[PDB]
Design a protein around this ligand. Structure first.
Ligand SMILES: CCN(CC)CCOc1cc2ncnc(Nc3cc(OC)c(Cl)cc3Cl)c2cc1OC
Ligand SMILES: CCN(CC)CCOc1cc2ncnc(Nc3cc(OC)c(Cl)cc3Cl)c2cc1OC
Lengths: 278, 271
């Protein structure tokens, strides 16, 4: 069902990312005259398995999920083709502080809202996705800084977003990841920044330690600061059963987003783009 | 396999439009907690309506309205799509109290995106068999980016009431004229038969100092494109590829920030 795209239609390949599951490059489609992204997934048994995996992802169609435009089924080369997200990843927005000295709260909360809507959609699919690897690197930002999430199985097929019960390989995985991401969005800090050995992070986390919550990490002027802190701490609870559903997150978040007028979101985006021009 | 959506999942229906093809309402999806739009359209007809909609499911592109699912009820068929908060191109062009200004950069962006969207549909394998492009089914998202839902007779080429592959460019030429003029094509003519007859004899919306002011950017190129697009002879009409070639230079003359300023100024004035 998912359209096949001849590799010969793609030109001007440029590196975007290099992960374990595959390389991602931007490319220009000859016929469509737009940019796309292609993930180069690093035998007939493998080809059959890779098509089935990608056709599962084809079911996901929602405004906050990265659209898959087709598959490159080449002889030596398998590739997933998606929309190109001009503004890159949430990780880049949060941590590139020369480029983005300020990120206005309304935009940050819009991002959080859209992430949760996207994951909520994935959780309501029948069946749900079996694999989960939500992180700031696979939350992408379109031309108007709206979210499209690309947390497909592909990552499984960094440990800071992974809940401790997953260290020894539940419907409570994504909310844990989201709580860390929320913390990261509100702080613009690296989770566990002091700790440099990932194994030390894993040990600490397994014993109930989490990214730091205080007046320094999470500024006083966070809207609904105390409710957000409460949401974060519930989301990354040691006990998976204590963690809220994404439904419950959305219920908590919708009030917060009502405090911003629609025009302030656009002003936040335009101020991002203006400052970035220097 | 286009997803089925139980009708009971949609709530708080509000009227958006009433056409011959069906009623369209906004609704809230209970599980997804977002706004959607639903078009309220025998087993032979139900199967044919599903087949038609599953063909549209293949089309995935930024400038094409996504179909999210089908309401497959016994007595009720319904297509569900994303909700487009800013409605149709027709509303933007013609509601001049609401929208006294629509800055040129925004108008050209709309034209560019329409052409990219139709170009996409024309490159599908196979291409779409049915064609009904009009300002009413060109929709505008929250930041006034286009999504076309082309899955009135002023957009119809003369050979329709006397070619298959030259229909959309004819409609696009009229739409282009309408975007640049903000006038109703054939506004003076009140009998639809007179429009059809006039068009069949080679008459078109008027091109002069009144319809298309001298201050339109790239006025000469745009007029050239319009007149080629609605040529009497279907063979003389350009491909959408050729439109895109002509348009890309024009769109390069605007900085990306001017588009956003145009949208914000639209929303401010609208208050
Ligand atoms: C260099 C330009 N930079 C500057 C800041 C901006 C543009 O950067 C990105 C655009 C992307 N567009 C779409 N997809 C991406 N990734 C991806 C693709 C997938 O399939 C194909 C899957 Cl399955 C998953 C992902 Cl995450 C993107 C990643 C990007 O930068 C990391
Ligand atoms: C001025 C009114 N305001 C606020 C109330 C702007 C909102 O207006 C609209 C939003 C729409 N959102 C999505 N789809 C539409 N239409 C449509 C849907 C289809 O299936 C579901 C098909 Cl198959 C085709 C179409 Cl055209 C829409 C049409 C609209 O008109 C007014």
């Amino acid at each position: 069902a998912l359209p096949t795209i001849p590799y010969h239609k793609l030109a001007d390949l440029r590196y975007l990312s290099r992960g374990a599951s595959g390389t991602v490059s931007s490319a220009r489609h000859a016929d469509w005259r737009v940019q796309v992204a292609v993930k180069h997934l690093h035998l007939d048994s493998e080809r059959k398995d890779v098509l089935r995996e990608a056709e599962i992802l084809h079911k996901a169609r929602f405004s906050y999920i990265l659209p898959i435009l087709g598959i490159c089924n080449e002889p030596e080369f398998l590739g997933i083709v998606t929309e190109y997200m001009p503004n890159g990843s949430l990780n880049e927005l949060l941590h590139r502080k020369t480029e983005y000295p300020d990120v206005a709260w309304p935009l940050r909360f819009r991002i959080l809202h859209e992430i949760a809507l996207g994951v909520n959609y994935l959780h309501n699919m029948t069946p749900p996705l079996l694999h989960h690897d939500l992180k700031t690197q696979n939350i992408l930002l379109d031309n108007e800084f709206h979210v499209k999430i690309a947390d497909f199985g592909l990552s499984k097929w960094t440990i800071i977003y992974m809940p401790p019960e997953n260290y020894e390989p539940s419907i409570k995985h994504d909310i844990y990841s989201y709580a860390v991401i929320t913390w990261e969005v509100l702080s613009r800090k690296q989770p566990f920044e002091d700790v440099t050995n990932p194994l030390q992070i894993m040990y600490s986390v397994s014993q109930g330690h989490r990214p730091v919550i205080n007046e320094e990490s999470l500024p006083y002027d966070i809207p609904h600061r105390a409710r957000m802190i409460s949401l974060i701490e519930s989301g990354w609870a040691q006990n998976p059963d204590e963690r809220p559903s994404f439904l419950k997150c959305l219920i908590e978040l919708e009030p917060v987003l009502r405090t911003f007028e629609e025009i302030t979101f656009l002003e936040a985006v335009i101020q991002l783009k203006k400052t970035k021009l220097q």
